Amino acid sequence: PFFTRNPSELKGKFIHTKLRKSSRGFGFTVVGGDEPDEFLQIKSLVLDGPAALDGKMETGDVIVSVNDTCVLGHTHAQVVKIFQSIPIGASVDLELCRGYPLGSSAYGSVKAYTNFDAERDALNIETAIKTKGVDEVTIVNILTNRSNEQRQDIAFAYQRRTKKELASALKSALSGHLETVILGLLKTPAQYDASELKASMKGLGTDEDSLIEIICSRTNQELQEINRVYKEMYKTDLEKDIISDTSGDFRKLMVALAKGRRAEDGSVIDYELIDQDARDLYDAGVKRKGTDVPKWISIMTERSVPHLQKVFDRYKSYSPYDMLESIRKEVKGDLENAFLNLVQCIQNKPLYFADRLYDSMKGKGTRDKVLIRIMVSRSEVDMLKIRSEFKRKYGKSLYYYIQQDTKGDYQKALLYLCGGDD
């Protein structure tokens, strides 16, 4: 939460831009400036409007000065009154500072580069691509220290300087697992999830594990973008593809989870409902011979995750087995695997990914597809929590295991995504 009210103590890039207030304002949304030491950054822009048409303003930029007046550390309502008082047709001068991300998970490992230069990085990447023997170290040292958004702009700058999409270029220069890591980093969170989903459903046999990991661990917000982008790329609804390659009660569970319509975190704790769901889960499984499966699917998919965390504790007051052990006894197959993965993500999702990373490396060889997908998909989310749970359980760091199990530039590429030892 870094904040300052002196411009000389900012360390981003400074942009000066002049805007003329249209009939629909300057056409941008501002956020921040609410809790004492808080910045004001650009939430969104209006494509039709003046702020975007000028092009100089980017989202996540901090408003330094508004027409000669420094607004660093001014309240949200103070600087809003400045812009609103500008008459239609009048012009405003904005000094903007970029390098301070608007939104960023506090527990990710890879952080946005402060001195970001999309054009320079695309030029340094093409330098490493064209090098005799290929300079894999440079491509790794660059793309693993940039956020996914910054990688979406480098892929723009690379096409604008080569007329060749950076994906195809790096595909031809890289090989082995290092190629798989880099190609996944160059996809948006929705793109990479949507690609690894379809890839799990190539051929009659399906990679049920990869399917279970992605669907069980993603949030409603993440699943909405996945369902959108999946039809965008593969010309078909993700639900539709799921009905095809899945079947049975396991199909119901995947379709319900993939809909991304879980109830948001309730404002008030439903203690009365926590007891009811806990008893219903008991009535529908271990209390009787047999299993009322749709009751499990309904409760475990429609309740908020904080709620379900508390029913799994309260469920121990009705059942001599916990929710995990009860799943192994009442059900089997891919339905069993799905339920076990699901409640792990509900109880402790970072621990869920820490356990998965340990399984991919504990035996002979590496399950590289699982290791790479987790390091890519959780690098900007909860990688620090994953590393935290990992060392507590297994005694040594996640860094130490990637070091033993992988080698080469591929090893260094994953160690950057890890983000240091523990």
Partner: peptide, 7 residues
């Protein structure tokens, strides 16, 4: 979920 204002 923070407060936004359109300018």
């Amino acid at each position: 979920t923070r407060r936004e204002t359109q300018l």
